Design an enzyme around this catalytic site. Structure first.
Site, PDB file in Angstrom:
ATOM      1  N   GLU A 103     -45.766  33.794  85.294  1.00 16.97           N
ATOM      2  CA  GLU A 103     -44.439  34.283  84.941  1.00 16.97           C
ATOM      3  C   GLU A 103     -43.898  35.207  86.024  1.00 16.97           C
ATOM      4  O   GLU A 103     -42.725  35.116  86.403  1.00 16.97           O
ATOM      5  CB  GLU A 103     -44.478  35.005  83.590  1.00 16.97           C
ATOM      6  CG  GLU A 103     -45.198  34.250  82.476  1.00 16.97           C
ATOM      7  CD  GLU A 103     -44.405  33.072  81.936  1.00 16.97           C
ATOM      8  OE1 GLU A 103     -43.262  32.859  82.386  1.00 16.97           O
ATOM      9  OE2 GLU A 103     -44.925  32.370  81.044  1.00 16.97           O
ATOM     10  N   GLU A 133     -38.173  35.268  83.107  1.00 17.82           N
ATOM     11  CA  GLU A 133     -39.529  35.357  83.632  1.00 17.82           C
ATOM     12  C   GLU A 133     -40.019  36.798  83.692  1.00 17.82           C
ATOM     13  O   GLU A 133     -41.230  37.037  83.613  1.00 17.82           O
ATOM     14  CB  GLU A 133     -39.611  34.698  85.007  1.00 17.82           C
ATOM     15  CG  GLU A 133     -38.980  33.320  85.119  1.00 17.82           C
ATOM     16  CD  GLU A 133     -39.690  32.225  84.329  1.00 17.82           C
ATOM     17  OE1 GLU A 133     -40.510  32.529  83.433  1.00 17.82           O
ATOM     18  OE2 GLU A 133     -39.411  31.039  84.615  1.00 17.82           O
ATOM     19  N   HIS A 136     -40.982  37.148  80.118  1.00 20.74           N
ATOM     20  CA  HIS A 136     -42.274  36.493  79.957  1.00 20.74           C
ATOM     21  C   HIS A 136     -43.416  37.344  80.519  1.00 20.74           C
ATOM     22  O   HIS A 136     -44.500  37.410  79.924  1.00 20.74           O
ATOM     23  CB  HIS A 136     -42.234  35.129  80.633  1.00 20.74           C
ATOM     24  CG  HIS A 136     -41.214  34.193  80.057  1.00 20.74           C
ATOM     25  ND1 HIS A 136     -40.914  32.977  80.632  1.00 20.74           N
ATOM     26  CD2 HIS A 136     -40.441  34.285  78.947  1.00 20.74           C
ATOM     27  CE1 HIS A 136     -39.994  32.365  79.906  1.00 20.74           C
ATOM     28  NE2 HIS A 136     -39.689  33.138  78.881  1.00 20.74           N
ATOM     29  N   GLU A 198     -42.480  23.711  84.736  1.00 19.04           N
ATOM     30  CA  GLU A 198     -41.832  24.009  83.466  1.00 19.04           C
ATOM     31  C   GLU A 198     -41.688  22.781  82.566  1.00 19.04           C
ATOM     32  O   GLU A 198     -41.994  22.856  81.372  1.00 19.04           O
ATOM     33  CB  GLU A 198     -40.467  24.652  83.737  1.00 19.04           C
ATOM     34  CG  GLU A 198     -40.571  26.058  84.344  1.00 19.04           C
ATOM     35  CD  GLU A 198     -39.229  26.649  84.767  1.00 19.04           C
ATOM     36  OE1 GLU A 198     -38.352  25.878  85.215  1.00 19.04           O
ATOM     37  OE2 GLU A 198     -39.055  27.886  84.661  1.00 19.04           O
ATOM     38  N   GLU A 232     -37.720  28.258  78.068  1.00 19.25           N
ATOM     39  CA  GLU A 232     -38.056  27.254  79.071  1.00 19.25           C
ATOM     40  C   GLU A 232     -37.138  26.043  79.012  1.00 19.25           C
ATOM     41  O   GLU A 232     -36.936  25.378  80.034  1.00 19.25           O
ATOM     42  CB  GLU A 232     -39.506  26.811  78.906  1.00 19.25           C
ATOM     43  CG  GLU A 232     -40.203  26.556  80.216  1.00 19.25           C
ATOM     44  CD  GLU A 232     -40.351  27.821  81.045  1.00 19.25           C
ATOM     45  OE1 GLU A 232     -41.224  28.653  80.718  1.00 19.25           O
ATOM     46  OE2 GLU A 232     -39.585  27.990  82.017  1.00 19.25           O
ATOM     47  N   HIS A 235     -34.562  26.418  81.387  1.00 17.94           N
ATOM     48  CA  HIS A 235     -35.053  26.300  82.755  1.00 17.94           C
ATOM     49  C   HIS A 235     -35.196  24.841  83.161  1.00 17.94           C
ATOM     50  O   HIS A 235     -34.792  24.450  84.262  1.00 17.94           O
ATOM     51  CB  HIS A 235     -36.393  27.019  82.884  1.00 17.94           C
ATOM     52  CG  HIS A 235     -36.359  28.462  82.482  1.00 17.94           C
ATOM     53  ND1 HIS A 235     -37.492  29.246  82.448  1.00 17.94           N
ATOM     54  CD2 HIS A 235     -35.335  29.266  82.109  1.00 17.94           C
ATOM     55  CE1 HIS A 235     -37.168  30.468  82.064  1.00 17.94           C
ATOM     56  NE2 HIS A 235     -35.865  30.508  81.851  1.00 17.94           N
TER      57      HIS A 235
HETATM   58 FE   LIG Z   1     -41.768  31.711  82.046  1.00 13.03          FE
HETATM   59 FE   LIG Z   2     -39.583  29.401  83.365  1.00 11.19          FE
END
Ligand SMILES: [Fe+3]
Ligand SMILES: [Fe+3]
Ligand SMILES: [Fe+2]
EC number: 1.14.13.25
Lengths: 515, 167, 391, 130, 391, 140, 130
Positions: A103, A133, A136, A198, A232, A235
């Site tokens: 992360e 992130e 995360h 991801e 995610e 992402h």
């Molecule tokens: Fe992440």
């Molecule tokens: Fe990510």
């Protein structure tokens, strides 16, 4: 007017602001990325989940309140922190802190995509990814912070950010979801970090593990990890947009299949054996064979919904796939041999597979008993768990010709005389330095890009030093200064000390000196 | 060979004393380039201080940088390399060099050597980073051209490795 | 039914819970329960902000402060390390030293901004229902606020994208959080301005909320010519991530930014009967002071006073400040030509008013940033330099 | 609709049976899949969306929808697309519920995901290429 | 080792959880899971707000709408019922009909007000750091805002206590939530006004934040004479809980309260360089608009148009409105004398600017309230009556 | 002065507002309770937990977010709603609903204490109690 | 501190023995107690305050403190008074923690309770009459 205006109640919805975000960018000569890249095609895409700064914060804040409510109030009142099986509580030391570094690098990797993007919507989108992130990172950090307070062994949960430097497993973690993302082509990050990292691997790494934690009494990890992956999907969408630009441009599309194959092998070479090992060996109750979890999430679903669908647009199935499936079946059993044998270098307490674990292993991976089960059983008969036995398997491995090598590229350990996974040892000398490579994909990377892969391995650094001296220098001890964090069993009595490690007389060799 | 402890050893102590004798910008520039040409990159001249050269190099950088701010005029920090060269000149010199390379092996050498010679504090940071990116763009495109075309056995010869073992 | 196993939860399933309880020792295996106890606390006791943030970056010992060893597993083509000392001229003994005084990790940062996000919409629903826009000066609203406060969102957007390389290149965790939070607040400022413009459009028929006129003003009007030059340089002309943070927040945004947002559009709003704009500047100003606290700690406490590299760092900071202050002075010099367009108000838009406003910005800037790095600055000289652009 | 079960196909075999198909020649390259996979994080709002949207209205329009109980989350696989209207969920729950409030508990997406209006969609289509 | 028993949890203890699972049937014993499904929903669907609020009050059938039966268990001495029709002149077919259009139960109400609570402290820390107070007109700050805006806090405090009997006497749950939330928003307005005075006292030396002068002005100054009289009457003169809510919010606070907060202190703050007061009035105006929506639904949708008693209720509302509009018109006439103390600004504090302000308040009220209950009002006549107090 | 001012970061704390709360009340003839009471003595007391409206909401919103996180996220994911012994689940039908009406009446009883109180701190304090009981009603 | 246990005195007896003392003549009027009872809701913040404030510093100064685990809450009874400094809890928890944040999980009080500065105090003293 000064007296007449429409007094209907109105605000401004997020998508009303986002509609104008593309016009925030303006043209000047120097408005280009600062990072090297092969991909120079036009990438004027639209961010799929239209987010503005305020809306981003309202949404994420809403996730945190439910998450920390569950952890800080409810699960604590239940005492759920000490209701985890020891095997799994130990595993979360590794899984959480290792994912935390991924992360953390994902922040930086997302910044490159932020820098290397051109559309103002994707810059604003990738900043949100950068924020996520960070979130995360603090979420993974919170798991170990929570375990440190409520789990019966805080050592390792409480200090992994330095005690991970001791051991060899941490090295390859610095590549798989870290250096592999941030040290390369910035636009290629849409392929390595996003299309592969991801879209493919976060599902088994972050979602699938939730069921394994629930099976082993851990309701902290699902509470947090399931909330992590909700970021995610945004992402994946952003990454796919750039991939469309690359596959639609013939000049940059001739770099896509190669980068996809390197990215997939880069990440699977470590993730496949290490996560397989931690799932099957770091649990008491198992959900399903690791090779089926891999087949579901990696081969079939990601391979089909992402790579196979894209196959109509020049995107080939990765040439390293056959080798990767073979790793998914056997490489984590290979990795277990090394992780059990070098347990004093870790920061977790391991448990040899008991009689019912062995039955399970041999049932789902026929052959496991004769190859790995016999070795594990012999280690137990030699005193693997007893601190007074003077026995540590790494020395046993060197006595029987089962030498351990570190891949110069991936840092993954390799025991060629026992490995059933994909691998073969190639030892080259170049400019007076010896290098050990383990597969055709890593070797090609090193042969073509040697200045990228100069990582010192544990044997080069620890050469000739006694094991307990290394451990004490790296702070691999509990608060009493002498009892190891790492243990070869998960009981509460007869824990190994520094003096117990010294009795075994283990000293690091130069594995490549015989060549 | 038995390694000394990781972060405090006689090898690092010895080079720190060696570094403390540097008293001018020209002396530290010659000292840092000789160090980088001899101990960094796969084309280094020696691996004798493999586990220590990165820390030692940092301490060299710290000495040269302090000397620059103590001794150099402010404009020279921004626009010139510590070799006396014009910073912008170094960028164009090395960009056109690697762009004229005929193979990935000529290209990779030019880029490696640029870093060995002009890595900050020799070249101003801003000039170095955008030059490093320009070189890296060219090196990356020539290497990712027909990446799987040469078999491993050929890549070993082309790289010039001595094969000590193939399982 | 289903094809897969409905796996039993170890926490509540009687059989698995019994197995678990039998294997969990009846005593703790260590007594150190402070997550990352070895972090050196900046404050009386270790804060949760520090525990979750510090040492997340896996830096080796050859980057000042690191706890790891060895080289990176994979580097750029040519050999650029994943993170390295070559990314900035500034030096330090420990890059982990920085501490946001607001102690913002991710959760408190979005919790605080979520509040602003939800309250704003309630405030806007009430303000529209109030009809309070009726008292606003129509010329200020249509000819100054709409066109020129709108054009300023490009300055904020520029300062936001300046952080993209910063987020990749900086060398520690607390710095990276400081940077990224600073950037989100900046694109927020850009978004909040366009939100206000879209809102007034709903209240005033004929009020055009399109960004075309603001964009045409930002990119061609000489009022923002100096500001756009400085922003384009800070954003894309440099990569020293310390130089970006310093030139962006400590020089440009602290002089031009503070003057445009606070001395012009927020102050003059309260002189032309504007009951709406101050609600939006109240947020950018709060964002500025919260970013300043973090920025002020990185460069003053950590870098300008580092025990070995303090004076070394001040040398670069002085040179940067010298360069980018001149850019911002010229930006302000072009900007004060906007006062020719506004309606004359005594002590606010006359020469004495602009002088007092310029004295406040440069006066505050001397105290907040200059005096702390040893940068000399004649405040009168800077004020008269900008006032030369006032008709 | 059995092809979208978590344990469909090879996942049903064990031991040598599984290993033989897993290492079979034809199964060494990816095969294009027309399906999508949506993971929903269990909570009060999601358990209500699963039963009264995905399995009622959603499965009526798309018979191939398979929903599996994975302890902490819901595993959904379906051919083509899956859609969830935040407006419909909001009426179901009696409280405001925009698209971003829906995304609070939408964990993973194997497929192309986007939000149009009040509707979250995960589709097998390749926008920009199809 | 404790004296009492460590109770095993049925959710996790293997033995008790097994017993529990064995006892729980493998099927639901009913399919109706909508909590209080039988509530008639006001909107497209039933809302959590309604499920949690509606029919919480145990009314019998002899109180219109009640689902229970029988007399109360215990009554006042003499026999006054716990809740009774004798509490208000207004009648309806169902007292449960009322619905807050904001749908505030307790949780969302404090969730929103907490966002405002935390953001305000952040704004003040930044505002002090900004020094933005330096551009405020000193006479306005010291002689008008400090004295008469602080005096205004007693009007809000007085409206707050007017709800004390309403919170006991009113006859349904959703009405009681509207009244109590309205009351907290009023004491908040009073507390928030004093917070601002305390805040300015920290930035301006000699700025006296004590409530003595404001109190002296509220209780003795003719400017607030009519305002205090109306407030003392609404609060303590009547006990019809409908009359209090109507006169307080729909007449007094909609006319005098709106002119003081919005047309005077907020509007003029943006004519005298006050960058701080519009942050505080933004909250009092948002609270007013939120209160008005709920007050409107109670008296317009429910009471003025009740199928059987609409015309009956409108008779009392018209009589009330006539009476308290007189008391408010008198309060405004007294209030507009404060314009003799402010420095004259074109179109804001001159006779023409006060008239446009008065036309806004009386004009908005005619649309928002009078038109909805059939109350006829000549707006120009009301403006001229108040303007007779302008000098 | 238009140039010099203290630019130290300051806000205003709850207890700084609550200090001036007693002065918010003023004297007039009709300023007494509207309800019958036998108790006509001086009750000029202080509130022991200095509470202001903004702080009341911040504190209770904090309680609410953890409680609803546990219910809507944590316990729901564990299926705890159907892990209750049937005897006890039935008992909660009458315990929670009967408590609900007691909490609902406590709203009104506090409003009587609100009206009969003579100190502005206790008038403000009892309104906070009135809101607490609305909270408890919606909780039950 | 045995007199402040939850099962002290008559609570120890069972059956006829408990009934005999419960209905004993001396036990038909209340008896003045110098104790106070504090109830703390079990949470992450409170479990730390119990172990490191109430049972360390708090029990050192007041050895009569008894803390009893009651599944969902902590039951604390002590002679005289119990004080908890939120400022001390903030340092311990490493996050902002005003006295109103302490009250988030301070459920019940048997005694006189107040907030003086950052300190919460429950006491057997009768402020206003003593
Ligand atoms: Fe992440
Ligand atoms: Fe990510
Ligand atoms: Fe209550």
């Amino acid at each position: 007017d000064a007296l007449k205006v429409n007094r209907a109640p109105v605000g401004v919805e997020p998508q009303e602001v986002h509609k104008w975000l593309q016009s925030f960018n303006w043209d000047f000569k120097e408005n280009r990325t600062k990072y090297p890249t092969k991909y120079h095609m036009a990438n004027e895409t639209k961010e799929q989940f239209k987010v503005i700064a305020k809306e981003y914060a309202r949404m994420e804040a809403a996730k945190d309140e439910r998450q920390f409510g569950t952890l800080l109030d409810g699960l604590t009142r239940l005492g759920a922190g000490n209701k985890v099986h020891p095997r799994w509580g130990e595993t979360m030391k590794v899984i959480s802190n290792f994912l935390e570094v991924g992360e953390y690098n994902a922040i930086a990797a997302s910044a490159m995509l932020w820098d290397s993007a051109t559309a103002a919507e994707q810059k604003n989108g990738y900043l949100a990814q950068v924020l996520d992130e960070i979130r995360h990172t603090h979420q993974c950090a919170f798991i170990n912070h929570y375990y440190s307070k409520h789990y019966h062994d805080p050592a390792g949960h409480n200090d992994a950010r330095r005690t991970r430097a001791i051991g060899p497993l941490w090295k390859g973690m610095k590549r798989v979801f870290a250096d592999g993302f941030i040290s390369g082509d910035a636009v290629e990050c849409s392929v390595n970090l996003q299309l592969v990292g991801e879209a493919c691997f976060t599902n088994p790494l972050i979602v699938a593990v939730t069921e394994w934690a629930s099976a082993n009494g851990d309701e902290i990890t699902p509470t947090v990890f399931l909330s992590v992956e909700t970021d995610e999907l945004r992402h994946m969408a952003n990454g796919y947009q750039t991939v469309v630009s690359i596959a639609n441009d013939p000049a940059s599309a001739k770099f896509l299949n190669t980068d996809l194959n390197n990215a997939f092998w880069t990440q699977q070479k470590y993730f496949t054996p290490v996560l397989g090992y931690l799932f099957e060996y770091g649990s008491k109750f198992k959900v399903e064979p690791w090779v089926k979890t891999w087949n579901r999430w990696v081969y079939e679903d990601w391979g089909g919904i992402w790579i196979g669908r894209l196959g109509k647009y020049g995107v080939e199935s990765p040439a390293s796939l056959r080798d990767a499936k073979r790793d998914a079946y056997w490489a984590h059993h290979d990795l277990a041999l090394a992780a059990y044998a070098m347990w004093p270098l870790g920061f977790a307490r391991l448990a040899l597979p008991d009689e019912e674990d062995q039955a399970w292993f041999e049932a789902n991976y026929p052959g496991w008993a004769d190859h790995y089960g016999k070795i594990f059983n012999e280690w137990k008969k030699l005193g693997y768990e007893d601190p007074k036995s003077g026995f540590i398997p790494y020395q046993w491995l060197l006595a029987n010709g089962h030498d351990v090598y570190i891949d110069r590229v991936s840092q993954v350990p390799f025991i060629p005389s026992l490995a059933k996974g994909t691998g073969s040892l190639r030892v080259h000398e170049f400019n007076g330095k010896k290098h050990s490579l383990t597969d055709d994909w890593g070797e090609r990377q090193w042969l073509i890009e040697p200045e990228r892969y100069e990582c010192h391995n544990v044997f080069e650094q620890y050469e000739g030093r006694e094991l307990s001296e290394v451990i004490a220098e790296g702070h691999g001890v509990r608060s009493d200064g002498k009892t190891l964090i790492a243990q070869p069993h998960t009981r509460g009595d007869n824990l190994w000390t520094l003096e117990d490690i010294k009795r075994a007389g283990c000293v690091f060799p130069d594995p490549l000196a015989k060549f | 060979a038995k390694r000394e402890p990781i972060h405090d050893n006689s090898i690092r102590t010895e080079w720190e004393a060696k570094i403390a004798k540097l008293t001018s910008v020209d002396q530290a520039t010659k000292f840092i380039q000789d160090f980088r040409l001899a101990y960094t990159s796969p084309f280094r001249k020696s691996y004798d201080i493999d586990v220590d050269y990165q820390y030692i190099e940092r301490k060299i950088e710290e000495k040269l940088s302090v000397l620059k701010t103590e001794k150099l005029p402010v404009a020279d920090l921004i626009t010139k390399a510590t070799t006396g060269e014009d910073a912008a000149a170094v960028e164009a010199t090395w960009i056109a060099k690697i762009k004229a390379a005929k193979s990935k092996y000529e290209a990779e050498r030019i880029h490696i050597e640029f870093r060995q010679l002009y890595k900050p504090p020799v070249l101003p940071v801003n000039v170095f980073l955008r030059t490093d990116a320009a070189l890296g763009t060219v090196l990356m495109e020539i290497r990712n051209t027909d990446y799987y075309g040469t078999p491993l056995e050929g890549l070993r010869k082309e790289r010039g490795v001595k094969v000590l073992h193939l399982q | 039914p289903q094809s897969s196993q409905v796996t039993k939860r170890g926490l509540t399933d009687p059989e698995r819970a019994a197995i678990i309880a039998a294997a969990v020792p009846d005593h703790a295996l260590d007594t150190q329960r402070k997550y990352h106890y070895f972090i050196q606390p900046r404050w009386k006791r270790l804060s949760e902000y520090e525990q979750l943030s510090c040492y997340a970056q896996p830096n080796p010992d050859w980057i000042a402060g690191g706890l790891d060893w060895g080289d990176w597993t994979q580097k750029f083509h040519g050999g650029r390390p994943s993170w390295g000392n070559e990314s900035t001229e500034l030096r330090t003994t420990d890059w982990y030293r920085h501490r946001d005084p607001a102690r913002r990790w991710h959760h408190p940062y979005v919790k605080d901004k979520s509040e602003e996000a939800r309250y704003t919409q309630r405030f806007l629903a009430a303000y529209s229902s109030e009809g309070s826009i009726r008292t606003i000066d129509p010329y200020w609203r249509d000819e100054i606020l709409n066109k020129y406060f709108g054009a300023l969102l490009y300055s904020e957007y520029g300062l936001f994208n300046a952080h993209s390389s910063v987020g990749r290149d900086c060398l520690s965790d607390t710095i990276r959080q400081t940077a990224v939070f600073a950037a989100l607040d900046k694109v927020d400022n850009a978004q909040m301005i366009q939100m206000e413009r879209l809102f007034i459009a709903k209240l005033v028929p004929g009020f055009d909320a399109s960004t075309d006129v603001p964009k045409k003003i930002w990119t061609t009007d000489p009022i923002y010519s100096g500001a756009r030059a400085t922003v384009q340089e800070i954003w894309q002309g440099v990569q020293d991530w310390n130089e970006i943070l310093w030139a962006g927040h400590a020089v440009y945004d602290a002089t031009f930014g503070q003057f445009a947002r606070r001395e012009f559009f927020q102050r003059l709003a309260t002189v032309y009967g504007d009951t709406l704009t101050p609600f939006f500047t109240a947020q950018s100003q709060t964002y500025f002071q919260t970013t300043r606290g973090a920025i002020d700690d990185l460069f003053v406490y950590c870098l300008a006073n580092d025990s070995e590299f303090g004076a070394h760092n001040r040398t670069f900071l002085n040179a940067w400040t010298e360069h980018y202050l001149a850019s911002s002075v010229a930006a302000l010099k072009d900007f004060v030509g906007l006062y020719a367009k506004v309606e004359k108000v005594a002590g606010a838009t006359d020469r004495a008013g602009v002088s007092e406003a310029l004295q406040r910005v440069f006066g505050d800037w001397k105290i907040d940033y200059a005096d702390k790095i040893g940068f000399r600055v004649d405040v009168d000289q800077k004020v008269d330099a900008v006032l030369a652009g006032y008709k | 609709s059995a092809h979208n079960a978590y344990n469909a196909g090879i996942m049903q075999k064990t031991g040598k049976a599984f290993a033989d198909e897993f290492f079979a020649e034809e199964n060494q390259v990816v095969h294009e899949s027309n399906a999508v996979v949506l993971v929903l994080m269990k909570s009060d709002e999601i358990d209500a969306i699963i039963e009264d949207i995905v399995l009622k209205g959603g499965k009526a329009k798309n018979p191939s929808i398979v929903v599996e109980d994975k302890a902490g989350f819901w595993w959904i696989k379906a051919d083509g697309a899956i859609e969830i209207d935040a407006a419909e969920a909001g009426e179901l729950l009696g409280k405001p519920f925009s698209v971003y409030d829906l995304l609070i508990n939408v964990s993973s997406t194997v497929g192309r995901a986007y939000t149009l209006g009040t509707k979250f969609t995960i589709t097998s289509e390749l926008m920009g290429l199809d």
